[PDB]
Amino acid sequence: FGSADDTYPYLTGEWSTKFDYPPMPFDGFLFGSRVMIAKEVKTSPDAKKCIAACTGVPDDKWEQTYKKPTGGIVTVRSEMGEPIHKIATRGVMLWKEFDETIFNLPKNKLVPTLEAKRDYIISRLNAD
């Protein structure tokens, strides 16, 4: 959610109608992303600029975050392996690549794969 407008049908209870269900009204709404640009969040200048310029995507196509960048946003896994929704910056996409290549591997294949990529790994750190 981001505006009063898209949020309204969930207040009327009219949203649930698209699915042939009785009107199903809600009591309130929370806005997480929508506020990240506000004059008073500590989000850095260049970062607010980055956030805006992300084209969104309808609920129609959010599933694609799992694979490609989708509206400028990918999922990426934390150190613990739980999914995280991040802006698809260069660093984040490296993090995603390592997520798929290096961190992916069994703890047995770790140290060998690192050494065979040491030059590459060390380079991509320094760049992105």
Partner: peptide, 10 residues
């Protein structure tokens, strides 16, 4: 690392 939702992004 910047965090954001795909749908709220629009």
């Amino acid at each position: 690392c910047i965090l954001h939702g795909p749908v709220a992004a629009q």
